[PDB]
Write an enzyme that holds these catalytic residues in place. Structure first.
Site, PDB file in Angstrom:
ATOM      1  N   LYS A  29       0.767  -2.667  -9.964  1.00 49.46           N
ATOM      2  CA  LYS A  29       0.439  -1.461  -8.818  1.00 49.46           C
ATOM      3  C   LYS A  29      -0.709  -0.591  -9.638  1.00 49.46           C
ATOM      4  O   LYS A  29      -0.585  -0.111 -10.941  1.00 49.46           O
ATOM      5  CB  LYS A  29       1.751  -0.579  -8.784  1.00 49.46           C
ATOM      6  CG  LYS A  29       1.328   0.695  -8.004  1.00 49.46           C
ATOM      7  CD  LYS A  29       2.623   1.437  -7.805  1.00 49.46           C
ATOM      8  CE  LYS A  29       2.371   2.630  -7.098  1.00 49.46           C
ATOM      9  NZ  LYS A  29       3.778   3.300  -7.010  1.00 49.46           N
ATOM     10  N   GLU A  75       0.783  -1.286   0.116  1.00 47.32           N
ATOM     11  CA  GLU A  75      -0.121   0.076  -0.115  1.00 47.32           C
ATOM     12  C   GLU A  75       1.014   0.943  -0.011  1.00 47.32           C
ATOM     13  O   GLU A  75       2.085   1.168   0.330  1.00 47.32           O
ATOM     14  CB  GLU A  75      -0.800  -0.017   1.353  1.00 47.32           C
ATOM     15  CG  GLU A  75      -1.863  -1.048   1.285  1.00 47.32           C
ATOM     16  CD  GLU A  75      -2.886  -1.093   2.583  1.00 47.32           C
ATOM     17  OE1 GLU A  75      -2.298  -1.193   3.800  1.00 47.32           O
ATOM     18  OE2 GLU A  75      -3.867  -0.487   2.576  1.00 47.32           O
ATOM     19  N   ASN A 114      10.160  -0.674  -0.306  1.00 49.95           N
ATOM     20  CA  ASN A 114      10.404  -0.762  -1.668  1.00 49.95           C
ATOM     21  C   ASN A 114      11.864  -1.196  -1.900  1.00 49.95           C
ATOM     22  O   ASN A 114      12.232  -0.946  -2.770  1.00 49.95           O
ATOM     23  CB  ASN A 114      10.074   0.148  -2.486  1.00 49.95           C
ATOM     24  CG  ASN A 114      10.350   1.539  -1.745  1.00 49.95           C
ATOM     25  OD1 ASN A 114      11.526   1.810  -1.091  1.00 49.95           O
ATOM     26  ND2 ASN A 114       9.586   2.840  -1.552  1.00 49.95           N
ATOM     27  N   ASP A 117      11.592   8.262  -2.901  1.00 49.39           N
ATOM     28  CA  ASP A 117      11.029   7.880  -1.882  1.00 49.39           C
ATOM     29  C   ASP A 117      11.392   6.518  -1.216  1.00 49.39           C
ATOM     30  O   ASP A 117      10.664   5.651  -1.125  1.00 49.39           O
ATOM     31  CB  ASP A 117       9.476   7.794  -2.211  1.00 49.39           C
ATOM     32  CG  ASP A 117       8.937   7.606  -1.007  1.00 49.39           C
ATOM     33  OD1 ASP A 117       9.359   7.992   0.217  1.00 49.39           O
ATOM     34  OD2 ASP A 117       7.417   7.179  -1.083  1.00 49.39           O
TER      35      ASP A 117
HETATM   36  C1  LIG Z   1       4.974  -1.575  -1.042  1.00 50.54           C
HETATM   37  N1  LIG Z   1       5.391  -1.312  -2.539  1.00 50.54           N
HETATM   38  C2  LIG Z   1       5.743  -2.090  -3.488  1.00 50.54           C
HETATM   39  N2  LIG Z   1       5.938  -1.893  -4.525  1.00 50.54           N
HETATM   40  C3  LIG Z   1       6.635  -2.781  -5.250  1.00 50.54           C
HETATM   41  C4  LIG Z   1       7.076  -2.094  -6.638  1.00 50.54           C
HETATM   42  C5  LIG Z   1       6.640  -3.952  -4.799  1.00 50.54           C
HETATM   43  C6  LIG Z   1       7.226  -5.241  -5.176  1.00 50.54           C
HETATM   44  C7  LIG Z   1       7.699  -5.489  -6.510  1.00 50.54           C
HETATM   45  C8  LIG Z   1       7.924  -6.613  -6.593  1.00 50.54           C
HETATM   46  N3  LIG Z   1       8.056  -7.879  -5.831  1.00 50.54           N
HETATM   47  C9  LIG Z   1       7.634  -7.572  -4.543  1.00 50.54           C
HETATM   48  N4  LIG Z   1       7.409  -8.571  -3.711  1.00 50.54           N
HETATM   49  C10 LIG Z   1       7.296  -8.716  -2.582  1.00 50.54           C
HETATM   50  C11 LIG Z   1       6.505  -7.221  -1.770  1.00 50.54           C
HETATM   51  C12 LIG Z   1       6.137  -7.196  -0.234  1.00 50.54           C
HETATM   52  C13 LIG Z   1       6.038  -8.303   0.509  1.00 50.54           C
HETATM   53  O1  LIG Z   1       5.379  -8.120   1.678  1.00 50.54           O
HETATM   54  C14 LIG Z   1       6.683  -9.536  -0.172  1.00 50.54           C
HETATM   55  C15 LIG Z   1       7.183  -9.644  -1.321  1.00 50.54           C
HETATM   56  N5  LIG Z   1       7.130  -6.241  -4.215  1.00 50.54           N
HETATM   57  S1  LIG Z   1       6.063  -4.050  -3.123  1.00 50.54           S
END
Ligand SMILES: CNc1nc(C)c(-c2ccnc(Nc3ccc(O)cc3)n2)s1
Length: 294
Positions: free
Chosen positions: A33, A12, A128, A123
């Site tokens: 996203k 989020e 991230n 950010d």
């Molecule tokens: C919070 N914002 C996030 N943004 C991206 C692009 C994310 C991303 C991209 C690619 N893979 C994952 N994996 C992942 C993210 C959070 C988790 O709690 C576990 C795995 N996350 S997470």
């Protein structure tokens, strides 16, 4: 896009929500996203597309961009864990120094690359920073800042985080440089070492004062031109700087030396990524693997 099926809310944030998703056609698992809408600025498009052209082993690759019905979907290569979860899972044991060292090295490699193309993240936070079981760590949402402007909350209105915000920003500087990312990274580096956020402010003034209580209240001696900053107030409380030995125990002196240069108030004197890479701390750098709990 009816080509993806969400599996679970993965994140989020400001723009919108993040989902783990299985491509119904290729069958691959990606991260989606959904952002939120009058006409979708073409400027944000140009820049979002320019971001799709940067390929480096330490930046989450933006596979694609689906602009549909004035709603933007960003497809990213999937990684198995954000650094925030990994930290909470290490809350009792802590992360080994060799792993912390490596992560920092890779993160600076990606930064060096993005910065040499005039691209900054804006950010950075544990949320991230994504790692894989192979020992790698990558930057995600890199540059997604030069796509809009900082609002007040999230998609459903929540709480962002000034914890990783460099002082020049908290002080009203609108034309900040690549240096803000180094500052962010330094905070994260310290968090990894101590298992506690460096500056967990609860308001913009608390954030700032927290940085001031630890690094001391800044002035023209360490940061020339600081008093000309938009939000600087001559009436700020004047706290003394505490030694890093107390801030990041028990990290070694090479790390503390590196962290120090990454947390310098003056953006210009703040060490760059490419230089950080040649720091003695990375003399015995290796690529150990993490112990992930997926
Ligand atoms: C919070 N914002 C996030 N943004 C991206 C692009 C994310 C991303 C991209 C690619 N893979 C994952 N994996 C992942 C993210 C959070 C988790 O709690 C576990 C795995 N996350 S997470």
């Amino acid at each position: 896009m009816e080509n993806f099926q969400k599996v679970e809310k993965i994140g989020e944030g400001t723009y919108g929500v993040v989902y783990k998703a299985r491509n119904k056609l290729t069958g691959e698992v990606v991260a989606l996203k959904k952002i939120r809408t009058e006409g979708v600025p073409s400027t944000a498009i140009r820049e979002i597309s320019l971001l799709k052209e940067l390929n480096h082993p330490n930046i989450v690759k933006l596979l694609d961009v689906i602009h549909t019905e004035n709603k933007l979907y960003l497809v990213f290569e999937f990684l198995h864990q954000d650094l925030k979860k990994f930290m909470d899972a290490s809350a009792l044991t802590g992360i080994p120094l060799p792993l912390i060292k490596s992560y920092l090295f890779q993160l600076l490699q990606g930064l060096a690359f993005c910065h040499s193309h005039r691209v900054l993240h804006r950010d950075l936070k544990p949320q991230n920073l994504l790692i894989n079981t192979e020992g790698a760590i990558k930057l995600a949402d890199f540059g997604l800042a030069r796509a809009f402007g900082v609002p007040v909350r999230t998609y459903t209105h929540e709480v962002v985080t000034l914890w990783y915000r460099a002082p020049e920003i908290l002080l009203g500087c609108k034309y900040y440089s690549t240096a803000v990312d180094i500052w962010s990274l330094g905070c994260i580096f310290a968090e990894m070492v101590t298992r506690r956020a460096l500056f967990p402010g609860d308001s913009e003034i608390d954030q700032l004062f927290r940085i001031f209580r630890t690094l001391g209240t800044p002035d023209e001696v360490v940061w020339p031109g600081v008093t000309s900053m938009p939000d600087y107030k001559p009436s700020f409380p004047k706290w003394a700087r505490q030694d890093f030995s107390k801030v990041v125990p028990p990290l070694d002196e090479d790390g503390r030396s590196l962290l120090s240069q990454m947390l310098h108030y003056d953006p210009n004197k703040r060490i760059s990524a490419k230089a950080a890479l040649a720091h003695p701390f990375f003399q015995d750098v290796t690529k150990p693997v993490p112990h992930l709990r997926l």
